[PDB]
Amino acid sequence: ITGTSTVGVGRGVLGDQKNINTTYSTYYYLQDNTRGDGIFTYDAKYRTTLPGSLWADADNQFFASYDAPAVDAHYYAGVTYDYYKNVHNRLSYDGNNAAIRSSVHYSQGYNNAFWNGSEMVYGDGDGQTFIPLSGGIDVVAHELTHAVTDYTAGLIYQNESGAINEAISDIFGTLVEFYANKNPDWEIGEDVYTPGISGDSLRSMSDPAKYGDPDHYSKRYTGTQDNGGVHINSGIINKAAYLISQGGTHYGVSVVGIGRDKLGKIFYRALTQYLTPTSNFSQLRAAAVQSATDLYGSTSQEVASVKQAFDAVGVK
Numbered sequence: 239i240t241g242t243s244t245v246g247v248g249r250g251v252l253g254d255q256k257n258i259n260t261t262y263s264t265y266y267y268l269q270d271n272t273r274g275d276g277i278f279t280y281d282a283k284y285r286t287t288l289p290g291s292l293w294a295d296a297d298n299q300f301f302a303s304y305d306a307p308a309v310d311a312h313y314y315a316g317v318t319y320d321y322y323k324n325v326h327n328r329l330s331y332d333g334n335n336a337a338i339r340s341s342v343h344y345s346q347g348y349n350n351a352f353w354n355g356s357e358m359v360y361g362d363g364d365g366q367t368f369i370p371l372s373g374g375i376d377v378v379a380h381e382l383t384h385a386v387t388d389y390t391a392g393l394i395y396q397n398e399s400g401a402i403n404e405a406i407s408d409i410f411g412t413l414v415e416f417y418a419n420k421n422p423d424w425e426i427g428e429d430v431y432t433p434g435i436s437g438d439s440l441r442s443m444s445d446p447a448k449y450g451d452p453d454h455y456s457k458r459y460t461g462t463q464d465n466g467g468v469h470i471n472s473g474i475i476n477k478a479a480y481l482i483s484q485g486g487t488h489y490g491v492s493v494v495g496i497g498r499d500k501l502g503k504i505f506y507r508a509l510t511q512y513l514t515p516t517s518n519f520s521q522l523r524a525a526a527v528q529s530a531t532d533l534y535g536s537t538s539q540e541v542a543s544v545k546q547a548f549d550a551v552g553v554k
């Protein structure tokens with residue numbers, strides 16, 4: 239809508255206060271004009287019709303419980319936008335400042351969130367398995383990273399390609415979480431999963447085995463569930479990324495850590511320059527080695543650590 243750019247204030251799903259960019263035209267709308275072609279957040283009002291209504295609020299204060307998922311989908315879309323722009327010089331998910339649209343209060347008791355090709359969609363969860371999913375910055379960034387992948391490598395969502403696709407979203411979801419700098423970690427969905435249970439999450443990048451996921455290629459899942467194990471086999475690449483950043487000795491293979499920023503550069507370059515729709519794990523290792531080579535030189539520590547990390551997870 240046309241109107242005045244304004245800054246409201248509210249509380250997200252976890253109860254923290256944050257400022258949000260709005261547009262004033264009789265009501266204050268969740269429309270942030272400061273980022274690319276705009277960030278727009280909509281109320282689906284418990285229906286499944288999309289996108290719903292551009293979110294309108296009378297007074298520019300967003301402290302009601304009903305407001306919290308909207309606050310976070312809007313705010314974390316902005317953080318994700320800032321991450322890709324400031325850290326990778328990428329303007330929105332398509333590199334051309336495409337508007338970011340998100341709908342919250344999608345359906346009822348819906349325990350999921352997804353990028354549908356044109357927008358983000360967030361369930362409220364059922365209150366037991368999940369609370370509203372936009373409350374997890376890593377979830378928001380994980381899903382928007384699928385759009386980045388769709389606009390770059392186009393990794394196919396099945397088997398090893400699909401597990402790379404998932405791991406890319408977990409890696410950049412986590413890097414966004416660290417960029418936001420509030421309560422980062424190397425777990426996925428910890429903020430919104432199982433409100434009754436402290437210290438769990440959907441999966442762990444530092445220790446995939448904590449939740450039954452493989453941490454080595456010899457333990458790869460080869461069944462047909464989950465599109466050939468895309469959220470299961472992602473543990474193998476997630477652990478490799480964790481080793482590259484933080485180091486460790488995994489199955490007796492020592493990896494010298496090079497930090498989060500360099501992990502980010504290496505994988506972003508691999509994703510945008512070298513991966514193709516059918517890249518398998520071995521081809522990912524080759525792309526990451528080539529990317530670290532381009533960035534740091536063939537004799538660098540960074541190249542050696544990428545090699546160690548893939549060796550440690552059994553990806554030749």
Ligand SMILES: [Ca+2]
Pocket residue numbers: 295296297298299300301
């Ligand atoms: Ca209000």
Ligand SMILES: [Ca+2]
Pocket residue numbers: 415421422423428429
């Ligand atoms: Ca966290």
Ligand SMILES: [Ca+2]
Pocket residue numbers: 376412415422423424425426427428
């Ligand atoms: Ca996390």
Ligand SMILES: [Ca+2]
Pocket residue numbers: 428430431432433434435436437438439
């Ligand atoms: Ca929990």
Ligand SMILES: [Cl-]
Pocket residue numbers: 249250251252253254255
């Ligand atoms: Cl919050």
Ligand SMILES: [Cl-]
Pocket residue numbers: 290291292
């Ligand atoms: Cl509307």
Ligand SMILES: [Cl-]
Pocket residue numbers: 301302303304
């Ligand atoms: Cl309330």
Ligand SMILES: [Cl-]
Pocket residue numbers: none
């Ligand atoms: Cl997913």
Ligand SMILES: [Cl-]
Pocket residue numbers: 444445446453488
């Ligand atoms: Cl481990």
Ligand SMILES: [Cl-]
Pocket residue numbers: 487488489490
């Ligand atoms: Cl180990």
Ligand SMILES: [Cl-]
Pocket residue numbers: 486487488489
């Ligand atoms: Cl380890």
Ligand SMILES: [Cl-]
Pocket residue numbers: 527545
């Ligand atoms: Cl190699």
Ligand code: NA
Pocket residue numbers: 440449450451
């Ligand atoms: Na699991």
Ligand SMILES: [Zn+2]
Pocket residue numbers: 380381384404407
């Ligand atoms: Zn995903």
Ligand SMILES: [Zn+2]
Pocket residue numbers: 486487488489
């Ligand atoms: Zn280990």
